[PDB]
Design a protein around this ligand. Structure first.
Ligand SMILES: Cc1cc2nc3c(=O)[nH]c(=O)nc-3n(C[C@H](O)[C@H](O)[C@H](O)COP(=O)(O)O)c2cc1C
Length: 147
């Protein structure tokens, strides 16, 4: 299958998770494309892809604010071509906050509104990929099986 992975990462934790995810799905016999949302042109970005995974950390002093490289892409979800495609979200976050990885539910809702199907429950964890390999491995499992 063809899998597209796009992320927005400020310190590198959501990046780390998106690279591990690329490795695990690619290992399953699938073609993975990895993009930093800061580099990606949204226009028809999903065309060709059987699933699309979105990674994005949560910030904001008060309410939830998305990582800014993702956000800019989030604005353009309308042109991506998500209708009838499979999608899932992941993120790095901090339990010590009220809205743990709040970007994840947010992505899932925008995606469903645009006609996407949610493949697996959003991955929510702390630190980089090495900090919770199980959580990463399992989320990749969930994804693989829906492909
Ligand atoms: C000011 C600020 C606000 C944050 N807010 C949240 C949040 O609300 N939810 C959450 O899970 N993590 C929150 N975090 C933790 C970061 O999301 C996480 O440590 C960081 O984004 C690592 O991901 P990244 O390196 O891929 O950017 C916050 C961090 C900073 C310092």
């Amino acid at each position: 299958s063809k899998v597209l992975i796009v992320f927005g990462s400020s310190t590198g934790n959501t990046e780390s998770i998106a690279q591990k995810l690329e490795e695990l799905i690619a290992a399953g016999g699938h073609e993975v494309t990895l993009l930093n949302a800061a580099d990606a042109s949204a226009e028809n970005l999903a065309d060709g892809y059987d699933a699309v995974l979105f990674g994005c950390s949560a910030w904001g002093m008060e309410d939830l604010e998305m990582q800014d490289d993702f956000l800019s892409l989030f604005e353009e979800f309308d042109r991506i071509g998500l209708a009838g495609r499979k999608v899932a979200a992941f993120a790095s976050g901090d339990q010590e906050y009220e809205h743990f990885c709040g970007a994840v539910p947010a992505i899932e809702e925008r995606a469903k509104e645009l006609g996407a199907t949610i493949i697996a429950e959003g991955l929510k964890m702390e630190g980089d990929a090495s900090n919770d390999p199980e959580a990463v491995a399992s989320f990749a499992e969930d994804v693989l099986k829906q492909l």
